Write a structure and sequence with these properties.
The structure is cut from a larger assembly and holds 7 protein chains of 7 kinds. Chain C is built from no helices and 7 strands. Chain C is mainly beta. By secondary structure, chain E is α+β, with helices and mostly antiparallel strands. The chains are: A alpha+beta, B mainly beta, C mainly beta, D alpha+beta, E alpha+beta, F alpha/beta, G alpha+beta. The complex binds adenosine-5'-triphosphate and magnesium ion (16 copies). Chain E binds 4 RNA strands through strand 1, strand 2, strand 3, strand 4 and strand 5. Chain B: Pfam families: Ribosomal_L33.
Chain lengths: 136, 50, 76, 116, 177, 236, 66
RNA sequence: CGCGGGGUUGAGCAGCCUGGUAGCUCGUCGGGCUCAUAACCCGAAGAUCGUCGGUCAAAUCCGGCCCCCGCAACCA
RNA sequence: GCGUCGUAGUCCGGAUUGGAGUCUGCAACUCGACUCCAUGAAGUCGGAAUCGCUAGUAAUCGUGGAUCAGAAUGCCACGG
RNA sequence: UGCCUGGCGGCCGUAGCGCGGUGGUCCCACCUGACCCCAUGCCGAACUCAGAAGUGAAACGCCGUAGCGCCGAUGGUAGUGUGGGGUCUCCCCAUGCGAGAGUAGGGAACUGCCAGGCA
RNA sequence: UCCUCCUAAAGAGUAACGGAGGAGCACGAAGGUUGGCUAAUCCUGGUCGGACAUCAGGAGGUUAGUGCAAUGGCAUAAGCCAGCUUGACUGCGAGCGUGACGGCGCGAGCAGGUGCGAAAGCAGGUCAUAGUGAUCCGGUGGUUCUGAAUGGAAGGGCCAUC
């Protein structure tokens, strides 16, 4: 489910999601799933979009997951007033900004790779694209 | 607060005293130090008292 | 809730910046540890406060083998 | 190491003296000789010096490098400083324990008119 | 003393020829000898330390220092400050005398003696050897101290290698293997 | 430790300091599991007997043979050896958290607390103490050698009756041997199995049994006399 | 040293069972007589003495006197 | 999850009191008494003190979690 | 009758082991008896409870015999 | 002035680590002895005192060498003060400032006052 | 109520029933000085000794330590050991910082006496920041300052203190 072990602090601030991404190049695999849009991307969406890639190739290739949630997102319970502290931690999300490479894969043909990435991008809430390794 | 207040009387015969604290459990002995006496303007030995 | 207490601000920081013409005994910088060190014609109180020892302009320098910030006072 | 542990042995006195701006009388005590010189408060300009290596002192001593050699150099530098004008000095231990021929060099110069 | 002169005469002319040294001082030499008696289980009472100190005062011509614990470890239930061992360092004349009365009177008295495992070096020519018994030396006549305290001896030499130290120690005819 | 059937035998004991002699023509043998109450007038050799028995004096005749399986623990009259400058823990334990009593080992805090000295009380200075606690700490300090031969020289000096009954109980399940000097006839009546009564002209009577039948032996060899005191005065 | 802190260091002349009398300084106060010394070294005899292993079929041939 | 309490052998309970020391009754096992079984007598065995952890040192002190048991959920 | 050991796990205790052997037997490993050297374990008189014995008996010491090539601390008899 | 060595500084890795060869006139370190003032929670290991038979082995100090450490542009990017505009949880335009990381590369320090050799 | 960190937008300051922790002491040495010393962790060898006890030498370069939370600091050590002592002094104080005020803090230097050091010098408590309670009313010791006709006293006042 990709939830960190032994975190220093339990609750974090809201923060802001600004700027452009850093891991914008395919490094290990030959085909990557670059994100174009911006937003936050939870742990279950990572899991649900990995069981779809794994079924498409279904025996072969290495699947690299570059993003990791490591960010607590709280919420107040139902029918409670404002104040009286901060809400309990429920799920963990990974902040995504344009240019970030989310998933990447090696060992499969380009056309079958494109099929697995299209199935992967129907579970993700941001506009993502398909990118291939280069030589710099 | 286990330390109790004690006063260092002046042995020079005048009425003058400092005031400090002392753990009467760990140190049941009687303190004595050479301090200053403004009344006489000399260094005299001060011994503790209630 | 369980938390929700703080402590009053202590108002540290440099008081006389670079180039100030200070008087004798005037406080130059309040600090907790020893961020700046005491150079020529300055002292250091028990609070690590740096105070002018003689009147004159302040000068900040990074002299030393460990690259430490020093505060000194010119005789101007 | 000997010398490295010696510079650190006498750095606080070397630094306190500089902060006071006092002329210092440094002492170097090798097993074969002993040296002494006086430096300006800044530390760059050195005014006078005397040592057992110097021939005018080594001429009279059978063995340079003992107490009777220290008394020679101590008196020699004191007679050299007082002719110039330096009468206010601060003794610089420089790391060597102030017991042996380091001391005799101090006492001889002190007795020879140096005010410290 | 006698062993020091033995060195100065017929160990220098041996080792300089053996290793083709280019200078006199390049020959290795012994600098110090250390005797350790880690009394260990003495947290119970101090008599185990007093008697061990007397033991080291007997074997060695000095008085032993008491070395205490450095780190509090609960695996052996000891905490920092506890006195745990007795140690004697010997340099010079007393080192030579102890060496003489070790390799002459002491070391052949070992029960089931077969010699010293010459492999047991620490890679710098320093040699370490336990004794497992206290009765080897004539300074104490058996039925005086209850326990049989085994101790450890360490010869420290100035060899930059290990075969140099081995050759030095074989020049004095050690019971090597 | 396990104690054999030859505990202590003295034969033809004789002692004197100058002209006046304390003990002469004294002999006995002590069996296993015995408590020996020693009684007599003040200054009659009772403590000198213990000094002889544990390597401190020399008889005029000799032959005080102990057993080969005897370990001796002694407790004397005066609490003077220990210094009035240490806490109870530092004094009894010697600063060690583990205390090997004879064979086994016990924590020092627990061992000292078995004598009614709790965690708070284990910080009190010895000079800043009472008489009864002084005696209790004396006993706890000198009874840690774990030897099965107790030589107690008036251990009931300044102990309340509750601690007295505690000692009376604790002296009966102890499997070794004990020799107690005491002027407390009521204390010794409970625990005494053998008697060492001193008399005039250096007579040291040895009798087997408790005071109850010692009185019957006296009434068998009866002598009746009641003119005990003189009761004169101090001043005119 | 430290001025009467250590036990006395006296020059005894100990002896062996075959002689080997030599001058060594030790904290004994009395020159003891003991067993062999390095002069009577079991360094050229003791090694083969310790060996007490080997030989079973030769034992059979001794039992096979028939 | 708003507030409290508790978790000690196979069962029921002490000891959590301000830190160094695991206890009672029943139950189990092995002998004895009896024609045999109960009852009774003697001897012995056992618990990582809920769990993840956080003082030389804790079952006790502190927190995370699990379970169970109570209480409160009022004025419109 | 004479000595020694002087109350100690011992000059008590003879278990269990390592070697060397002798016999009967076609054959001694599982699985015999005994001998020699060394090794020297529990054990310091025994909880609840329980057994025999009235006289040459109880207690203690030794000898013999049936089975049997070899193999009794058992069984059956005899005396002090 | 050349040349090397010692003491006190300036400036703090472009100056510090590592690899190799080097020097014993003088100076430097080990060195020899320690009874003596002096010291070892044991020891001339260290700190001291007497000296000088050897040695440059160790340790210093010299150079040579790009395995490190270290310094490091130009250009671009991120951010951002003021003024405007968008589909405005984010951006864009005019103007002013302008990183960080990284690349090219530079890289075995320079030096100022005294005493002592040698020439 | 007090202390430390973040929110706090690179001077100071800045709220919430915002996010995480501590205090209501200790020390007669755990203070002052004069000497002296430098940690964690790992590797190899070495009696009972082991994953880890003491010893020996190599790497390591403060990942160590501080009387107790956090932050800043500390090699000239503020960390560790020893000797001698009481400056954990009296009267003052140029000049500053911080508060609406009550108040709180820092401070060279002057006068009297003192400790350490051969001296230069250092010392008006502790590496710093928490360890705390105005006034009234009383208690204790000193002080001719006043003392209701005068001489005393009572009671006040002043200093130290509960
Ligand atoms: N060293 C000695 N020199 C001289 N006289 C001695 C010495 N030791 C003991 N004595 C004498 O012997 C006696 C010692 O006292 P002892 O031990 O007999 O005490 P006690 O009176 O029997 O008992 P308690 O201790 O109950 O008073 C005294 O009479 C004393 O004078
Ligand atoms: Mg026998
Ligand atoms: Mg036999
Ligand atoms: Mg037994
Ligand atoms: Mg027996
Ligand atoms: Mg009948
Ligand atoms: Mg029979
Ligand atoms: Mg027959
Ligand atoms: Mg048969
Ligand atoms: Mg700010
Ligand atoms: Mg505001
Ligand atoms: Mg401190
Ligand atoms: Mg210092
Ligand atoms: Mg300090
Ligand atoms: Mg502090
Ligand atoms: Mg009047
Ligand atoms: Mg009044």
């Amino acid at each position: 489910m990709l939830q960190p072990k032994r975190t220093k602090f339990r609750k974090m601030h809201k923060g802001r999601n600004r700027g452009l991404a850093q891991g914008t190049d395919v490094s290990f695999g030959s085909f990557g799933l670059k994100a174009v849009g911006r937003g936050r991307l939870t742990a279950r969406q990572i899991e649900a979009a990995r069981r779809a890639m794994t079924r498409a190739v279904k025996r072969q290739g290495k699947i690299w997951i570059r993003v990791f949630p490591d960010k607590p997102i709280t919420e107040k319970p139902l029918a409670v007033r404002m104040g009286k502290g901060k809400g309990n931690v429920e799920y963990w999300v990974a902040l995504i900004q344009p240019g970030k490479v989310l998933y990447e894969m090696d060992g499969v043909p380009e056309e079958l790779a494109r099929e697995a990435f299209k199935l992967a991008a129907a579970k993700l809430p941001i506009k993502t694209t398909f990118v291939t390794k280069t030589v710099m | 607060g286990i330390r109790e207040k004690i006063k260092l009387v002046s042995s020079a015969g005048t009425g003058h005293f400092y005031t400090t604290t002392k753990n009467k459990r760990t140190k049941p002995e009687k303190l004595e130090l050479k301090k200053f006496d403004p009344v006489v303007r000399q260094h005299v030995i001060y011994k503790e008292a209630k | 809730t369980r938390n929700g207490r703080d402590s009053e601000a202590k108002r540290l920081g440099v008081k006389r910046f670079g180039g100030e013409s200070v008087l004798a005994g005037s406080i130059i910088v309040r600090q907790r540890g020893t961020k700046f060190h005491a150079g020529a014609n300055v002292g250091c109180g028990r609070d690590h406060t740096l105070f002018a020892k003689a009147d004159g302009k302040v000068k900040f320098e990074v002299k030393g083998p460990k690259n430490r910030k020093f505060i000194s006072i010119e005789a101007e | 190491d000997k010398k490295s542990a010696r510079i650190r042995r006498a750095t606080r006195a070397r630094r306190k003296l500089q902060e006071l701006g006092a002329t210092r009388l440094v002492v170097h005590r090798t097993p074969r000789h002993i040296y002494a010189q006086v430096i300006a408060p800044n530390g760059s300009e050195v005014l006078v010096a005397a040592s057992t290596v110097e021939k005018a002192i080594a001429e009279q001593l059978k063995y340079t490098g003992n107490k009777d050699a220290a008394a020679a150099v101590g008196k020699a530098v004191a007679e050299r400083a007082l002719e110039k004008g330096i009468k206010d000095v601060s003794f610089d231990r420089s790391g060597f324990q102030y017991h042996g021929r380091v001391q005799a060099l101090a006492d001889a110069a002190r007795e020879a008119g140096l005010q410290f | 003393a006698k062993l020091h002169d033995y060195y100065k005469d017929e160990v220098v002319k041996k080792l300089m020829t053996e290793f083709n040294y280019n200078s006199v001082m390049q020959v290795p030499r012994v600098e110090k000898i250390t005797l350790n008696m880690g009394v260990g289980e003495a947290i119970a009472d101090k008599k185990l330390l007093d008697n061990a100190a007397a033991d080291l005062a007997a074997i060695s011509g000095q008085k032993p220092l008491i070395t205490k614990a450095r780190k509090s470890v609960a695996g052996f239930k000891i905490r920092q400050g506890y006195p745990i061992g007795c140690k004697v360092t010997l340099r010079g004349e007393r080192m030579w005398e102890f060496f003489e009365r070790l390799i002459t009177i002491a070391v052949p008295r070992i029960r089931d003696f077969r010699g010293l495992s010459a492999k047991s070096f620490d890679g710098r020519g320093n040699y370490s050897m336990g004794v497992r018994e206290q009765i080897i030396f004539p300074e104490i006549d058996y039925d005086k101290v209850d326990r049989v305290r085994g101790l450890d001896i360490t010869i420290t030499t100035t060899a930059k290698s290990d075969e140099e130290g081995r050759a030095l120690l074989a020049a004095f005819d050690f019971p090597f293997r | 430790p396990r104690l054999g059937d030859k505990v202590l035998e003295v034969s033809n004991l004789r002692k004197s300091y100058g002209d006046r002699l304390l003990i002469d023509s004294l002999s006995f043998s002590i069996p296993k599991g015995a408590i020996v109450g020693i009684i007599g007038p003040n200054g009659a050799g009772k403590s000198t007997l213990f000094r002889m028995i544990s390597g401190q004096e020399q008889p005029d005749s000799g032959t005080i043979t102990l057993g080969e399986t005897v370990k001796l623990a002694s407790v004397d009259q005066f609490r003077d050896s220990m210094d009035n400058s240490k806490t109870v823990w530092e004094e009894v334990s010697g600063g060690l958290d583990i205390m090997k009593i004879g064979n086994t080992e016990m924590p020092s805090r627990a061992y000292v607390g078995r004598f009614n000295f709790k965690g708070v009380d284990q910080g009190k200075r010895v000079g800043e103490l009472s008489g009864g606690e002084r005696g209790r700490l004396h006993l706890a300090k000198l009874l840690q050698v774990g030897g099965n031969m107790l030589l107690l020289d008036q251990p009931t000096n300044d102990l309340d009756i509750e601690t007295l009954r505690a000692l009376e109980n604790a002296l009966l399940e102890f499997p070794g041997c004990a020799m107690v000097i005491s002027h407390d006839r009521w204390f010794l009546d409970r625990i005494a199995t053998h008697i060492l009564d001193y008399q005039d002209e250096g007579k040291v009577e040895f009798f087997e049994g408790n005071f109850t039948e010692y009185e019957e032996y006296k009434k068998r060899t009866l002598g009746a006399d009641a003119l005990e005191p003189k009761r004169i005065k101090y001043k005119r | 040293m430290k001025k009467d802190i250590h036990p006395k260091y006296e020059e005894i002349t100990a002896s062996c069972s075959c002689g080997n009398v030599m001058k060594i300084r030790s904290t004994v106060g009395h020159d003891l007589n003991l067993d062999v010394c390095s002069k009577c070294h079991p360094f050229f005899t003791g090694k083969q003495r310790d060996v007490a292993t080997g030989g079973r079929v030769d034992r059979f041939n001794k039992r096979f006197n028939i």
